[PDB]
């Protein structure tokens, strides 16, 4: 039933359709695989006995759309790697039906920038149909995606990513990584693997919590930032039906989930969201950016990583900018988090002797798998704000005559022979 492992080869999107307009050659329409129950939970909102969460599916859709489009920039290159994923939601509520993708070269002639505009219902409640033929005590829910006229639609999100499509550098990606996983495995004994109660951390179940309580430290009660040691355990992922895993690495969604989680905890400590001390108020992300600087090593899952955050700046001129990545809504207060995570052991050295070069081989660096920023809104004030700006919604006779002429000739000649 679960598929907690998913090879990178497979994607969540069906065949894309290029637009026929001469000036819209770069424009494609993407239809996502809702039919498969495998992608159904990832491509559809989770239902709580609704959560409004979007990063579970927005990031996945954008990343896999770019993965599909990679071919026009890969040029036959050995490896393709995505990064600089920016998302800004215009309407926190509502699900997604399809997306429009415009691809360009960006700046460098070796990368591929994309622009995804998501179109679909701006209200999931209307499409919701509760308890359809429950049978067993737990009903199975279904959504009416393509509706004739009963649903009001509009842009819900705008994102942009870019892939580098380059070669496999042996040094930064084979034998330095080879050493770093070994060092992390050796360091595995330093930490205490005690989980944390999800009530003060934003998750409902103790099966989807990856944040070691003994190694969560806050500065001035989290008013200046926070640090936390976490582990994306294969055990945690397997019996959790939302996120999956790769062969060795951990996807960006399962890396950003921990960021969201530690953000919820730090928000509780900073008095930004109401704790449980009932219903749970899980702050939701409106706009977030995530980048991976070189070398673009992935986040290893089975080995621990330390996440680090900045103090939450509560917005009543954004520090980032007006382009994609900053929120496109105004109203209720938001909470900004800059985050960086380290996956590696930078403090292990092996100085066999001065004569040799111990540092060029056995030295290493705690890489930064994902860095970036997130904007969050309190779960209770989801409906308080409205989108600020306005974006428009992206919405044979001569051949037949010639063919019939050809058939006329053919059937006429058929008699003579």
């Amino acid at each position: 039933s679960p598929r907690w492992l998913r090879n990178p080869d497979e994607l969540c999107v069906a065949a894309l359709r290029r637009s026929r307009d001469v000036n819209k050659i770069n424009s494609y329409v993407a239809t996502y695989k809702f039919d498969d129950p495998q992608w159904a939970p990832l491509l559809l909102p989770e239902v709580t006995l609704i959560s409004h969460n979007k990063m579970i599916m927005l990031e996945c859709m954008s990343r896999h759309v770019n993965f599909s489009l990679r071919h026009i920039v890969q040029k036959g290159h050995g490896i393709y790697l995505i990064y600089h994923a920016q998302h800004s939601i215009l309407q926190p509520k509502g699900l997604v039906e399809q997306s429009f993708v415009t691809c360009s070269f960006g700046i460098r002639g070796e990368r591929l920038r994309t622009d995804i505009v998501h179109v679909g219902p701006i209200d999931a409640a209307d499409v919701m149909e509760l308890q359809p033929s429950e049978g067993h005590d737990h009903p199975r829910c279904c959504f009416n995606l393509y509706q004739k006229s009963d649903v009001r639609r509009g842009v819900i999100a705008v994102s942009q990513v870019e892939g580098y499509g380059t070669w496999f550098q042996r040094k930064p990606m084979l034998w330095q990584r080879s050493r770093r996983i070994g060092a992390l495995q050796s360091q595995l004994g330093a930490f205490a693997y005690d989980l944390v109660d999800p009530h003060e951390v934003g998750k409902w179940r103790d099966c989807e919590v990856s944040l070691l309580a003994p190694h969560m430290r806050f500065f001035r009660n989290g008013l200046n930032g926070a640090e936390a040691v976490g582990i994306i355990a294969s055990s945690q992922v397997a019996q959790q039906r939302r996120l999956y895993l790769g062969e060795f690495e951990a996807p960006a969604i399962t890396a950003l989930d921990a960021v969201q989680q530690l953000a919820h905890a730090s928000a509780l400590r900073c008095k930004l969201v109401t704790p449980v001390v009932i219903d749970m108020e899980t702050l939701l992300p409106l706009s977030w950016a995530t980048r991976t600087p070189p070398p673009y090593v992935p986040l290893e899952a089975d080995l621990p990583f330390k996440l680090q955050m900045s103090r939450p700046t509560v917005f009543a001129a954004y520090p980032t900018g007006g382009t994609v990545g900053s929120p496109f809504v105004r109203g209720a207060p938001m909470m900004m988090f800059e985050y960086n995570m380290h996956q590696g052991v930078d403090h292990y050295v092996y100085d066999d002797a001065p004569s040799a070069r111990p540092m060029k081989w056995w030295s290493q660096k705690s890489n930064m798998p994902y860095s970036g920023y997130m904007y969050f809104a309190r779960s209770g004030l989801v409906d308080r704000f409205t989108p600020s700006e306005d974006i428009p919604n992206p919405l044979p006779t001569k051949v037949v005559q010639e063919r019939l002429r050809k058939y006329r000739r053919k059937q006429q000649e058929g008699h003579k022979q």
Binding site: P2, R3, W4, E247
Partner: peptide, 14 residues
């Protein structure tokens, strides 16, 4: 096998 290495953790449904 790699799948045999993952089956000890949990099974997958492709």
């Amino acid at each position: 096998t790699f799948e045999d290495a993952n089956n000890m953790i949990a099974p997958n449904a492709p």
